[PDB]
Scaffold this motif. Structure first.
Motif, PDB file in Angstrom:
ATOM      1  N   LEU A 248       0.831  -1.201   0.000  1.00  0.00           N
ATOM      2  CA  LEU A 248       0.000   0.000   0.000  1.00  0.00           C
ATOM      3  C   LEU A 248       0.866   1.251   0.000  1.00  0.00           C
ATOM      4  CD1 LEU A 248      -3.024   1.067   0.322  1.00  0.00           C
ATOM      5  CD2 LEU A 248      -2.527   1.145   2.771  1.00  0.00           C
TER       6      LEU A 248
ATOM      7  N   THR B 251      -0.682   7.479   1.151  1.00  0.00           N
ATOM      8  CA  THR B 251      -0.952   6.763   2.392  1.00  0.00           C
ATOM      9  C   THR B 251       0.157   6.954   3.416  1.00  0.00           C
ATOM     10  OG1 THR B 251      -0.011   4.758   1.387  1.00  0.00           O
ATOM     11  CG2 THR B 251      -2.407   5.021   1.310  1.00  0.00           C
TER      12      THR B 251
ATOM     13  N   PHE C 220      -0.100   9.392   6.708  1.00  0.00           N
ATOM     14  CA  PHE C 220      -0.575   8.859   7.978  1.00  0.00           C
ATOM     15  C   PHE C 220       0.506   8.125   8.759  1.00  0.00           C
ATOM     16  CE2 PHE C 220      -4.244   9.114   5.143  1.00  0.00           C
ATOM     17  CZ  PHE C 220      -5.129   9.835   5.921  1.00  0.00           C
TER      18      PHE C 220
ATOM     19  N   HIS D  68       3.412  -3.155  12.196  1.00  0.00           N
ATOM     20  CA  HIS D  68       2.041  -2.678  12.073  1.00  0.00           C
ATOM     21  C   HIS D  68       1.204  -3.582  11.181  1.00  0.00           C
ATOM     22  CE1 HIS D  68      -1.157   0.141  12.617  1.00  0.00           C
ATOM     23  NE2 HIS D  68      -1.276   0.375  11.322  1.00  0.00           N
TER      24      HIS D  68
ATOM     25  N   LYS E 291      -0.469  -6.126  13.382  1.00  0.00           N
ATOM     26  CA  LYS E 291      -1.672  -5.558  13.982  1.00  0.00           C
ATOM     27  C   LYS E 291      -2.817  -5.547  12.979  1.00  0.00           C
ATOM     28  CE  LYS E 291      -1.024  -6.155  17.255  1.00  0.00           C
ATOM     29  NZ  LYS E 291      -2.013  -6.902  18.079  1.00  0.00           N
ATOM     30  N   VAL E 292      -2.573  -4.978  11.796  1.00  0.00           N
ATOM     31  CA  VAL E 292      -3.592  -4.956  10.750  1.00  0.00           C
ATOM     32  C   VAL E 292      -4.061  -6.371  10.431  1.00  0.00           C
ATOM     33  CG1 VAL E 292      -4.052  -4.354   8.362  1.00  0.00           C
ATOM     34  CG2 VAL E 292      -2.751  -2.788   9.796  1.00  0.00           C
TER      35      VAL E 292
ATOM     36  N   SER F 291      -6.124  -8.211  13.318  1.00  0.00           N
ATOM     37  CA  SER F 291      -7.503  -7.742  13.337  1.00  0.00           C
ATOM     38  C   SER F 291      -8.252  -8.226  12.107  1.00  0.00           C
ATOM     39  CB  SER F 291      -7.557  -6.215  13.418  1.00  0.00           C
ATOM     40  OG  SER F 291      -7.276  -5.628  12.162  1.00  0.00           O
TER      41      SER F 291
ATOM     42  N   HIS G 197     -10.175   5.060  12.720  1.00  0.00           N
ATOM     43  CA  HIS G 197      -9.721   5.594  11.440  1.00  0.00           C
ATOM     44  C   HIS G 197     -10.503   6.834  11.032  1.00  0.00           C
ATOM     45  CE1 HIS G 197      -8.081   1.525  11.382  1.00  0.00           C
ATOM     46  NE2 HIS G 197      -7.240   1.944  10.455  1.00  0.00           N
TER      47      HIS G 197
ATOM     48  N   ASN H  96      -9.551   4.505   0.952  1.00  0.00           N
ATOM     49  CA  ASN H  96      -8.265   3.850   1.151  1.00  0.00           C
ATOM     50  C   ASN H  96      -8.401   2.484   1.815  1.00  0.00           C
ATOM     51  OD1 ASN H  96      -5.931   6.094   0.569  1.00  0.00           O
ATOM     52  ND2 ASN H  96      -7.820   7.043   1.324  1.00  0.00           N
ATOM     53  N   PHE H  97      -9.532   2.206   2.467  1.00  0.00           N
ATOM     54  CA  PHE H  97      -9.742   0.879   3.041  1.00  0.00           C
ATOM     55  C   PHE H  97      -9.834  -0.177   1.950  1.00  0.00           C
ATOM     56  CE2 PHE H  97     -11.933   3.299   6.631  1.00  0.00           C
ATOM     57  CZ  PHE H  97     -10.727   3.445   7.282  1.00  0.00           C
TER      58      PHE H  97
ATOM     59  N   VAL I 126     -15.088  -5.967   4.825  1.00  0.00           N
ATOM     60  CA  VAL I 126     -14.260  -5.345   5.852  1.00  0.00           C
ATOM     61  C   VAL I 126     -14.096  -3.858   5.569  1.00  0.00           C
ATOM     62  CG1 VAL I 126     -11.926  -5.251   6.794  1.00  0.00           C
ATOM     63  CG2 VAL I 126     -13.062  -7.449   6.539  1.00  0.00           C
TER      64      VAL I 126
HETATM   65  C1  HEM Z   1      -8.603  -3.308   5.998  1.00  0.00           C
HETATM   66  C2  HEM Z   1      -8.016  -2.137   6.270  1.00  0.00           C
HETATM   67  C3  HEM Z   1      -7.385  -1.743   7.630  1.00  0.00           C
HETATM   68  C4  HEM Z   1      -7.303  -2.434   8.785  1.00  0.00           C
HETATM   69  C5  HEM Z   1      -7.832  -3.851   9.095  1.00  0.00           C
HETATM   70  C6  HEM Z   1      -6.606  -1.616   9.759  1.00  0.00           C
HETATM   71  C7  HEM Z   1      -6.316  -1.965  11.064  1.00  0.00           C
HETATM   72  C8  HEM Z   1      -5.629  -1.198  11.989  1.00  0.00           C
HETATM   73  C9  HEM Z   1      -5.320  -1.552  13.360  1.00  0.00           C
HETATM   74  C10 HEM Z   1      -5.702  -2.876  14.054  1.00  0.00           C
HETATM   75  C11 HEM Z   1      -4.655  -0.545  13.936  1.00  0.00           C
HETATM   76  C12 HEM Z   1      -4.149  -0.576  15.409  1.00  0.00           C
HETATM   77  C13 HEM Z   1      -4.062   0.783  16.108  1.00  0.00           C
HETATM   78  C14 HEM Z   1      -2.744   0.927  16.840  1.00  0.00           C
HETATM   79  O1  HEM Z   1      -2.420   0.053  17.683  1.00  0.00           O
HETATM   80  O2  HEM Z   1      -2.013   1.923  16.594  1.00  0.00           O
HETATM   81  C15 HEM Z   1      -4.507   0.502  12.932  1.00  0.00           C
HETATM   82  C16 HEM Z   1      -3.886   1.725  13.071  1.00  0.00           C
HETATM   83  C17 HEM Z   1      -3.610   2.627  12.074  1.00  0.00           C
HETATM   84  N1  HEM Z   1      -4.039   2.543  10.763  1.00  0.00           N
HETATM   85 FE1  HEM Z   1      -5.052   0.941   9.901  1.00  0.00          FE
HETATM   86  N2  HEM Z   1      -6.282  -0.423   9.145  1.00  0.00           N
HETATM   87  C18 HEM Z   1      -6.740  -0.463   7.842  1.00  0.00           C
HETATM   88  C19 HEM Z   1      -6.610   0.540   6.905  1.00  0.00           C
HETATM   89  C20 HEM Z   1      -5.835   1.667   7.029  1.00  0.00           C
HETATM   90  C21 HEM Z   1      -5.559   2.643   5.995  1.00  0.00           C
HETATM   91  C22 HEM Z   1      -6.130   2.556   4.564  1.00  0.00           C
HETATM   92  C23 HEM Z   1      -4.775   3.599   6.521  1.00  0.00           C
HETATM   93  C24 HEM Z   1      -4.167   4.862   5.867  1.00  0.00           C
HETATM   94  C25 HEM Z   1      -4.016   5.025   4.548  1.00  0.00           C
HETATM   95  C26 HEM Z   1      -4.514   3.237   7.895  1.00  0.00           C
HETATM   96  C27 HEM Z   1      -3.739   3.955   8.773  1.00  0.00           C
HETATM   97  C28 HEM Z   1      -3.546   3.649  10.096  1.00  0.00           C
HETATM   98  C29 HEM Z   1      -2.783   4.437  11.032  1.00  0.00           C
HETATM   99  C30 HEM Z   1      -2.063   5.756  10.707  1.00  0.00           C
HETATM  100  C31 HEM Z   1      -2.819   3.832  12.218  1.00  0.00           C
HETATM  101  C32 HEM Z   1      -2.135   4.335  13.507  1.00  0.00           C
HETATM  102  C33 HEM Z   1      -0.708   3.801  13.559  1.00  0.00           C
HETATM  103  C34 HEM Z   1      -0.079   4.171  14.878  1.00  0.00           C
HETATM  104  O3  HEM Z   1      -0.214   5.345  15.309  1.00  0.00           O
HETATM  105  O4  HEM Z   1       0.549   3.283  15.511  1.00  0.00           O
HETATM  106  N3  HEM Z   1      -5.179   2.059   8.174  1.00  0.00           N
HETATM  107  N4  HEM Z   1      -5.111   0.061  11.766  1.00  0.00           N
END
Ligand code: HEM
Ligand code: HEM
Ligand code: HEM
Ligand code: HEM
Lengths: 140, 146, 146, 140
Positions: free
Chosen positions: C31, C38, C41, C63, C66-67, C70, C92, C102-103, C137
């Protein structure tokens, strides 16, 4: 990409703007913040309250860039390269918010020039805004 | 989206100062003009070859009138956009195969057409109020999109 | 939102043949390189200037777990796909302001990476199912965007 | 548009494709029809059942144009203007479908060329197919 009539419409439409472009840019930004307030997050250093001096002087800037783009329709990548560095490389603006500002700018134009904002001119300018958007959100 | 009464009063207030058939006819026409691939969904409508032909098409005027009637029916049930647009959502989904992204294009055309008709009375606050409405209509039109 | 159990068996049976941690690392990394806005962020994540740097970025891999974890939970409740992600859509939307388009992009990376790891065994049927998973999702992470 | 890096990765990546193109172009279509069944309404006269003579022969045509696009990157509007007329003027394909088809192409290359489908190449190819999409979807 644009057609001859797009180019003709864009240039024709840009001529009718004249010195109102500076204000049309300031209004477009204000409409973008009022309707899409998450775009405020791109301007944390700005006073983004309506009538703010900073948005005024920045609408004049965006305007000057659009008139430049309108007179260089063949090669936008060249004439906007320095501006593509800003919005893509360092700022990294999500392409969605160019659609937002493009829509607000066309709302502005519809709101100020009704007899000139024909469906044909509208279609050409939408494509115009799509071409400049593609140039600026490119090359990170 | 849910709207404060100040926004409802703004939307319904400005709606009573335009004639909807003009809005509908102009919004659908501009959609077909600005986004040419949407013409594909309107082959029984005849000539859509130019901006001239589109805005002169009598079937376009007729359909924009019916579209704006449903939109107007949404304006009276803003807190019930799901149920009010159930019938039209499934029609667009299962039968017409209209991609849901295009609902927001037509919604945007409705905003821009209001600005055309209203000038400076379509304030930035007026736009944000209507932007919330068309985004709700566009959402409601597309969640029964199985 | 609802897969046939043929599709459901296709996703769980092929998930067991990959290591979710590198699916998440590669997907999140891809991504960032393919849709580089992206990266805005991700400024605390350090160096994101090149493809190799993103792929060698240790916190991007961290990260992605984590993604992907979940995401793994999403694969355990394909029927209540909305409730498991409600905390994430909350996060988000209102605290990070990720645009919901963006998801879809990240879900596409998960699909491309699954194909990468699995080769021939990622048939069009395998993709058709997994497309439904990422589509649902993505819409789930968007339920709170008003 | 693309960068010199993107142009270098496109020719190189397509170069490593070789005689596999026609095969990939058919599998891509087969992936699109299966994942996104509404896309099948664009081919009401085709067989479009898994394995097909017509879909396979059509996948070659798709693969041939992409090879042409891959060696004409600095002038896609010229070398694709015939294809633009078919998809934009004649068929009027919804832009959303060019993204679906682009996505299935990258799944195909990822599924077949692990070692060559690097994140950098992936990035350059997504800009490649997106540039081609813009031309093929634009009126002009
Ligand atoms: C299927 C799509 C996605 C899933 C399942 C997902 C899942 C997650 C999870 C579980 C976290 C944990 C929060 C943490 O502990 O910091 C997180 C944080 C975050 N996500 Fe995603 N996300 C998705 C899409 C996106 C997209 C498209 C973006 C940006 C373009 C994004 C940007 C972020 C950011 C910036 C964080 C905080 C990171 C941090 O400060 O540590 N996410 N997301
Ligand atoms: C037609 C589209 C656009 C054009 C022509 C444009 C043009 C410009 C111009 C001329 C500048 C000032 C450059 C200078 O003189 O230093 C600028 C800066 C900037 N632009 Fe835009 N822009 C566009 C879209 C956007 C959008 C959609 C956003 C965010 C939602 C945005 C955010 C910014 C920011 C944050 C700055 C920095 C201003 C500062 O730091 O004071 N731009 N842009
Ligand atoms: C604000 C968004 C929209 C609203 C409120 C809306 C509403 C309506 C209404 C009221 C009808 C008439 C149904 C009937 O009389 O039985 C209709 C039908 C139809 N809609 Fe829309 N619609 C919207 C968006 C779209 C879009 C985006 C497209 C295609 C790009 C589209 C294409 C059609 C077609 C083709 C028909 C049937 C007309 C015919 O078969 O001749 N609609 N819609
Ligand atoms: C970059 C992507 C694409 C490329 C390179 C491409 C290329 C082509 C080519 C080379 C032809 C044959 C033209 C001829 O016979 O002279 C064709 C025809 C066609 N394409 Fe595509 N196409 C693309 C995307 C799409 C999409 C997304 C759709 C619809 C969902 C589509 C639908 C069609 C149809 C219906 C035909 C007519 C088939 C026939 O009558 O034989 N194409 N395209």
């Amino acid at each position: 990409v644009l057609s001859a009539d797009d180019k003709a419409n864009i240039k024709a439409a840009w001529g009718k703007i004249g010195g109102h472009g500076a204000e049309y840019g300031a209004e477009a930004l204000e409409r973008m913040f009022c309707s899409f307030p998450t775009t405020k997050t791109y301007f944390p250093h700005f006073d983004v309250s309506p009538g703010s001096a900073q948005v005024k002087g920045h609408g004049a800037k965006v305007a000057g860039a659009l008139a430049t783009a309108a007179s260089h329709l063949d090669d936008l990548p060249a004439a906007l390269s320095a501006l593509s560095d800003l919005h893509a490389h360092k700022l990294r603006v999500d392409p969605v918010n160019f659609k937002l500002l493009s829509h607000c700018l066309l709302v502005t134009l519809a709101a100020h020039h009704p007899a000139e904002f024909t469906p044909a001119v509208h279609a050409s300018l939408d494509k115009f805004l799509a071409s400049v958007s593609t140039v600026l959100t490119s090359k990170y | 989206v849910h709207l404060t009464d100040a926004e409802k009063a703004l939307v319904t207030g400005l709606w009573g100062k335009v004639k909807p058939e003009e809005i509908g006819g102009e919004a659908l026409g501009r959609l077909l003009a600005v986004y040419p691939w949407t013409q594909r969904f309107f082959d029984s409508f005849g000539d859509l070859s130019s901006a001239s032909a589109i805005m002169g098409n009598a079937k376009v005027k007729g359909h924009g009138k019916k579209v704006i009637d449903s939109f107007g029916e949404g304006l009276k049930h803003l807190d019930n956009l799901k149920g009010t647009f159930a019938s039209l959502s499934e029609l667009h989904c299962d039968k017409l195969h209209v991609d849901p992204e295009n609902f927001k294009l037509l919604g945007n055309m409705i905003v821009i057409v209001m600005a055309h008709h209203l000038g400076k009375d379509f304030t930035p606050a007026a736009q944000a109020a209507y932007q919330k409405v068309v985004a709700g209509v566009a959402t409601a039109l597309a969640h029964k999109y199985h």
